[PDB]
Amino acid sequence: NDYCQHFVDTGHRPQNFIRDVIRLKDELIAKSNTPPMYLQADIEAFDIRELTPKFDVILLEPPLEEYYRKCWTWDDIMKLEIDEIAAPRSFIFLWCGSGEGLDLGRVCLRKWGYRRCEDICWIKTNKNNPLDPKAVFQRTKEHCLMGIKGTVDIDLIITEEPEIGNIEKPVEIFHIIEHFCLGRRRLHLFGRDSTIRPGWLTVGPTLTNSNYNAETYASYFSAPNSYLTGCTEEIE
């Protein structure tokens, strides 16, 4: 059964035929989650250094020109000073799309001081709906690269192609990150009102409200909570 032949014949992408798409751990994550914090900021014009403390996890979702068929070019993304707000041992999750970002985003990771350790693929089914010039094939996926600096889940997210103009990335990315148990100071750059989430600081230009206070934020991680994984009990 050749699913590529089938796709050429019918318009059904091969991923359409993949079948089939721990609790207490989610409870432990949900218990130790800081209250959602969020700040409206124009990130190009904003000294990212006043975001403190250094973060254990950074989720970086710049608005790529290709998502639309204010955009950020990889030129702009590469000039972000991500290394200035990353904890010495920290992790980054960078959405790179499916074009040149697959290479330029790897440049960014190295520029900011990370080495890649996972390539998480968002495979987009078109069960409800049977071109870049440089493209050779139809692009049906996006990549989210995972970076580490310093010293359960699989690397695939399968969902239906969102409606045109919908740029949301699948919420499953957050479950994957949180199940790694990498620390509690978590930053989502270029999030939206729709992505605000307990356990996360969201910064982005389209947010409509802010509640961020650097001292209140640092509050949540003072002793005896400085080094928690976010997957453990609350320290009584």
Partner: protein
């Protein structure tokens, strides 16, 4: 021409200038992650194999970065990336994360014309066979992309031999060459029929 041809050899030492120009190159190298060092990989004479065409390059682990490097050194621009989702016979998926997929980089060189860009998608779904054994779907995809053209695979194994394809690899069974111009340049370059150093 048309039927499968192959050459058992060490790809490090073979003079691939005898083989001519190809519309498609596919390589599945033994990255050091009988392997080749990064320098050995950087030094392979890929650039002579093509003037205008595509390169399909299987990558994994840090070869994801290194393969991009060889890809650019050899003179290609990476313009696509195929992923093969690994399933069992029931279409379910088989360091930090478990891996459900293998990656194959797509590089373009020159300006190829007359190829049918856009017929397949960049995701393959297919069953796993032997360890290190690639899905036949890639040959179907590559055929629709550039039908009837000469293609060469590097580091293939005996099951990989295909019509329109010359397969190179050190576990193939001897030499099997049918293209006349290739037989000719082979005999000229290797009269006593041996290939070392």
């Amino acid at each position: 021409l048309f039927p499968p041809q192959w050459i058992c050899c060490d790809i490090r030492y073979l003079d691939v200038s005898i083989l001519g120009k190809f519309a498609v190159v596919m390589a599945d190298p033994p990255w050091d992650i009988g392997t080749l060092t990064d320098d050995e990989m950087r030094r392979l004479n890929i650039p002579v194999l093509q003037d205008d065409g595509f390169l399909f390059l299987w990558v994994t682990g840090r070869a994801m970065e290194l393969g991009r490097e060889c890809l650019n050194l050899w003179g290609y621009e990476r313009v696509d990336e195929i992923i093969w989702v690994k399933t069992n016979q029931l279409q379910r998926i088989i360091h930090w994360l478990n891996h459900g997929k293998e990656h194959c980089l797509v590089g373009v060189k020159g300006n190829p014309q007359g190829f049918n860009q856009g017929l397949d998608c960049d995701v393959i779904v297919a069953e796993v066979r032997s360890t290190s054994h690639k899905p036949d779907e890639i040959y179907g995809m590559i055929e629709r992309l550039s039908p009837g053209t000469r293609k060469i695979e590097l580091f293939g194994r005996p099951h990989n031999v295909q019509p329109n394809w010359i397969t190179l690899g050190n576990q193939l069974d001897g030499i099997h060459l049918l293209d006349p111009d290739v037989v000719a340049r082979f005999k000229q370059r290797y009269p006593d029929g041996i290939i070392s150093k």
